[PDB]
Amino acid sequence: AYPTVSEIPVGEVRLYQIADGVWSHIATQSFDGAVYPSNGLIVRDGDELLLIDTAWGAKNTAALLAEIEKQIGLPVTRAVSTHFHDDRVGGVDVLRAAGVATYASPSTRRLAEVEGNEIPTHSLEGLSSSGDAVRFGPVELFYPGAAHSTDNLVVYVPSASVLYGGCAIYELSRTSAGNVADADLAEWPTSIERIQQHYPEAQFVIPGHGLPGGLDLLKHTTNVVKAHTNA
Ligand SMILES: C=C(C[C@H]1O[B-](O)(O)c2cccc(F)c21)C(=O)O
Ligand SMILES: [Zn+2]
Ligand SMILES: [Zn+2]
């Protein structure tokens, strides 16, 4: 049932409904020779939608907003980018131009500016230290510590017990480290432990790229990360 990378042409966006008012969005993009799927989240808050991460690029994010109008019919009023790389902020400008208020932590906004990437407008307060969590409309934002990047956020949707890991959580099919130039490999297993200790009742865990699972994706990610570190 969950759409897979070979099912989504670059430029099209799938929505997958996880629970009442909780969707993931799935798109695909070419990077360094290969085509990757990429996940974010849509969470209904009454008559508005919160968006978690772009669809990775201006074209995909415009297709995202178009799919939301067709399939859901509620406006996206706020977006959160979970770290500073292009599959999370790429398309912020399309969101801004459509009227979406775009958010990220101060660190993410600074890392995005330094790297040349699109920059969310608004700063998220309360997320500076590992273990910090804040409610943001219908979701909980959690800063687990440095992992895939130093700034990466994870997101929990209480109504549905959905944990979105972003690029800090790998899918089961991913058995090698996914480009770790900006990662903190010594801290990543500890940051994952913080996630486990905070959301032990998670039912549905979504990696940044690929198929959702359970909390077994956290242990898998630690294994992949430690395996890369020892050799
Ligand atoms: C192998 C994946 C690539 C994917 O993730 B990224 O580092 O946010 C990032 C940035 C730019 C391109 C891109 F394909 C990606 C990974 O886990 O890092
Ligand atoms: Zn990244
Ligand atoms: Zn990524």
Instruction: Write the CB contacts of 52 (distance below 8 Å, at least 6 apart in sequence).
Output: 40, 41, 42, 43, 79, 80, 82, 139, 155, 164
Cβ–Cβ < 8 Å for 178, 188 = no
Tokens representing residue 52 in the block: 């978690």
Q: Confirm if 176 and 228 have CB atoms less than 8 A apart.
A: yes
Asked whether 10 lines ligand 1 (CB < 6 A), one says no
Tokens standing for residue 48? 């508005």
Nearest Cα to 49, choosing from 80, 77, 81, 89?
77
d(CA 157, CA 84): 21
Residue 56 Cα, ligand 3 centroid: separation in angstroms? 9
Resolution, angstroms, 1 dp: 1.9
For ligand 1, say whether the CB of 171 is within 6 Å of any of its atoms: no
Task: Name 97's Cβ contacts closer than 8 Å, sequence gap at least 6.
Answer: none
- CB atoms under 10 Å from CB of 141, counted, come to 22
* Structural biology method used: X-ray
Ligand 1 pocket mutation, candidates 30, 31, 52, criterion most atoms within 8 A of CB:
31
Amino acid at 7: E
Q: In this structure, which residue's CA is closest to atom 18 in ligand 1? A: 178
Residues known to be catalytic: 83, 85, 87, 148, 179
Tokens of 202: 């998670």
Ligand 1 atom 2: residue of nearest CA = 178
Q: Return the residue whose CA atom lies nearest to atom 14 of ligand 1.
A: 31
Pocket test for ligand 1, best of 54, 88, 179 (most atoms within 8 A of CB): 179
Joined together, the tokens standing for residue 210 give: 């690929």
User: Cβ neighbours of residue 137 under 8 Å, at least 6 residues apart?
Assistant: 43, 45, 50, 78
Q: Can you list the domains of the chain with their CATH numbers?
A: 5-230 (3.60.15.10)
DSSP state of 124: P
Do 23 and 42 form a contact (C-beta atoms < 8 A)? yes
